Amino acid sequence: SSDVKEFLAKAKEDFLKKWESPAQNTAHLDQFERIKTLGTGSFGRVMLVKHKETGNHYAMKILDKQKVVKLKQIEHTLNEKRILQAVNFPFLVKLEFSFKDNSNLYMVMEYVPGGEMFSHLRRIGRFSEPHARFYAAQIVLTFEYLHSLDLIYRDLKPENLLIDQQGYIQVTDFGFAKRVKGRTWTLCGTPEYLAPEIILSKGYNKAVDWWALGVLIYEMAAGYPPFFADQPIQIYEKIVSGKVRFPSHFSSDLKDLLRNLLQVDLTKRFGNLKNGVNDIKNHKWFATTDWIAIYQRKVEAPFIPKFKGPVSINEKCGKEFSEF
């Protein structure tokens, strides 16, 4: 009943402290040793770095300030960082340090080597229902956490979910996340996951995440998404039709839960009803889920992945990123 209610009061207090005085320049570039490139983002390279004194490894995203200006992403970049430095939940990736210099912004991210659920679902084909359920449980709780903070996630999809070295889920990207009470209108996200009210530009709220959960659950258990096609536009068309076919092996409870998540009518969608998340949590498809044990990372994972161990002399855009 009320153990939940105080956990969330304390979570909000923690979030708001950090959200009202965000932390700045918490480290410096000369503290990290470059190892190699991990990849590329939009504004620059992602580097595997090693903290020179603690020995811990991080994914440091480098962001060219001028390229951020040029791609029209100042506000989104400020906001992403502000959200990341403020949150804290066992299935969310950490922003471990941030800092800036003349040329760049740096986001030193927690680095768990692994491989996305994207690559895993594709090469395994599909997950059994308890396997899907175990991941889904982690997203339910994660959304319950983000939503209590008025944060809409807005980018749920297999590619943003890493399967960690304990086989637990980690949400790895906060690119589209937005803090809003009430409603907002930005068309963003990967087409297969979008709620029809996003596509129709009628404004929408945190309930799109719950539609997107329903999409994810269906994909994990079917091996393919419920709404699909060659072109984004056809995908959008199929969603607005709202004609979901379930595989023959989907249990009754799964189909039941799925009709309530992929539910067009907001007065009926599981998630934002007067009962909120408990409507999902008490749902029959999750009767076997130990919520508390899930949060504590105690449930035995159904699969553990294969182990691994891997600037200008002028100041640029000082005013634009002063809040960074």
Joined tokens for residue 107: 């986001």
CA distance 172 to 91: 9
CA 77 vs CA 72, 203, 300, 314: distances in Å:
10, 23, 37, 21
Binding site per annotation, positions: 38-46, 61, 110-116, 157-160
Joined tokens for residue 108: 């030193």
CA distance 13 to 35: 38
CA distance 117 to 51: 28
Q: At 8, is the secondary structure helix, strand, or coil?
A: helix
Per-residue b or e along 287-296, where b marks 16 or more CB atoms closer than 10 Å to that residue's CB: eebeeeebbe
Q: At 46, is the secondary structure helix, strand, or coil?
A: strand
* CB contact set of 124 (below 8 Å; sequence gap of 6+): none
CA 186 vs CA 71, 121, 196, 200: distances in Å:
17, 29, 13, 11
- Per-residue DSSP letter, 204: B
Instruction: Read off φ and ψ for residue 198, nearest 5 degrees.
Output: -75, -50
Joined tokens for residue 116: 């996305």
Closest CA to 229 of 242, 240, 238: 238
Question: How do strand 95-100 and strand 178-179 relate by DSSP bridges?
Answer: unpaired
Q: Catalytic residue at 155?
A: yes
Angle between helices 2-20 and 129-148 (to 10 degrees): 60
Binding site per annotation, positions for ATP: 38-46, 61, 110-116, 157-160
Q: At 72, is the secondary structure helix, strand, or coil?
A: coil
Burial of 50 (0-12, 13-18, 19+ CB in 10 A): middle
Joined tokens for residue 276: 């909120």
* CB contact set of 208 (below 8 Å; sequence gap of 6+): 152, 154, 194, 195, 197, 198
Return the amino acid letter for 40.
T
Active-site residue, from 14, 64, 101, 155: 155
Q: Longest C-alpha distance within the chain, in Å?
A: 64
Asked if residues 113 and 48 have their Cβ atoms less than 8 Å apart, the reply is no
Element (H, E) at 222: helix 207-222
Q: Which domains does the chain have, with CATH numbers?
A: 1-21+116-306 (1.10.510.10), 22-115+307-322 (3.30.200.20)
DSSP string, 126-166: ---HHHHHHHHHHHHHHHHHHHHTTEE-----GGGEEE-TT
Q: Which residues pair with 64 in a beta bridge?
A: 104
Asked if residues 283 and 270 have their Cβ atoms less than 8 Å apart, the reply is yes
Other CB atoms within 10 Å distance of the CB of residue 119: 13
